[PDB]
Amino acid sequence: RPRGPRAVFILPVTAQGEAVLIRQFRYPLRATITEIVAGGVEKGEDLGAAAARELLEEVGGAASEWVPLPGFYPQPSISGVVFYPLLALGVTLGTIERVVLPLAEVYRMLEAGEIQDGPSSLTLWQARGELTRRGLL
Amino acid sequence: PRAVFILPVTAQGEAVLIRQFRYPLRATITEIVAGGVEKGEDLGAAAARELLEEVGGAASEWVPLPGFYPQPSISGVVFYPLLALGVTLIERVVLPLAEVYRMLEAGEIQDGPSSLTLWQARGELTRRGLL
Numbered sequence A: 001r002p003r004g005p006r007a008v009f010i011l012p013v014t015a016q017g018e019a020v021l022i023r024q025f026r027y028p029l030r031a032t033i034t035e036i037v038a039g040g041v042e043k044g045e046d047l048g049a050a051a052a053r054e055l056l057e058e059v060g061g062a063a064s065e066w067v068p069l070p071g072f073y074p075q076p077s078i079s080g081v082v083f084y085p086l087l088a089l090g091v092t093l094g095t096i097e098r099v100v101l102p103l104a105e106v107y108r109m110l111e112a113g114e115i116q117d118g119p120s121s122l123t124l125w126q127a128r129g130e131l132t133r134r135g136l137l
Numbered sequence B: 001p002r003a004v005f006i007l008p009v010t011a012q013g014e015a016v017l018i019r020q021f022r023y024p025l026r027a028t029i030t031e032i033v034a035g036g037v038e039k040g041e042d043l044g045a046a047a048a049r050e051l052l053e054e055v056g057g058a059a060s061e062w063v064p065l066p067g068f069y070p071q072p073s074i075s076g077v078v079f080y081p082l083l084a085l086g087v088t089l090i091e092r093v094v095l096p097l098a099e100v101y102r103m104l105e106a107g108e109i110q111d112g113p114s115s116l117t118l119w120q121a122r123g124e125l126t127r128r129g130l131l
Helices: A047-059 A103-112 A118-133 B043-055 B097-106 B112-127
Strands: A006-012 A018-026 A031-035 A037-040 A065-068 A082-089 A096-102 B002-008 B014-022 B027-031 B033-036 B061-064 B078-085 B091-096
Touching: A006 A018, A006 A047, A006 A118, A018 A047, A018 A103, A031 A118, A037 A047, A047 A065, A047 A082, A082 A118, A096 A103, A103 A118, A118 B112, B002 B014, B002 B043, B002 B112, B014 B043, B014 B097, B033 B043, B043 B061, B043 B078, B078 B112, B091 B097, B097 B112
Parallel strands: A006 A082, B002 B078
Antiparallel strands: A006 A037, A018 A031, A018 A096, A065 A082, B002 B033, B014 B027, B014 B091, B061 B078
16 A cells, blocks of 8 residues: 655754754764754654654654644655655754754854755755744744 | 756746656656766766756856755765856756745755755855845
8 A cells, every 4th residue: 555655854943942953873974964853654653643753762852833844855866755854843852962052053054064964954944934933043 | 976966047037947757756846957977077067067968058157055965874975066057048947036936935846955955055046136
């Protein structure tokens, strides 16, 4: 029964306007790289539910509000996978290293090219209008 | 392991986008110009070649943009985007920037690498008053 593979990407932002990032070792780099939260969506999993699960499991986070952002294909030339980005707000926090930075610094990094992870960079760009409107950025 | 992505913009402030069939998607989708970089090629050269081959285009000016891994969990490939300006001229499509950036924001550009390229180039287009 066709539903293609899916992963959810979450930009988690605290009440204080900090992004919750991770530095995750990636084998094709033999190095770590700065990323937002992400993971595959399970068989019987709704997008909303995969997102909360991943936020909990990867950074020990929970969100007060979820804002869905436009889905995209990370590599449509070789793969049918779809990445679904979400902005998580009001986030509280109880291989991978968690990295909490003020949003102004994250967007300075973004503009400078220092965020080389494509899916994370695209999510940050898509969330930017929302964060500016709320005065978080 | 390198590819070059090109956003082509005309002196009139129109972007030149493509409609391309993508077999993993069983759909044709809106993209910018992109192609793989050959062995004895540097990035500028490849971008100009690929612009010519794909949309019949030639640019008066180039603004490089930041490189990115499309999928570092899985691949070490790097994509290198460039904005091409004063462009003059596999379905090719020409649109006013204002419409292209409406499409970007709406989610109508489904290809992540093209979208990121568009986002990365937006400050420059604004700076220049093309957008």
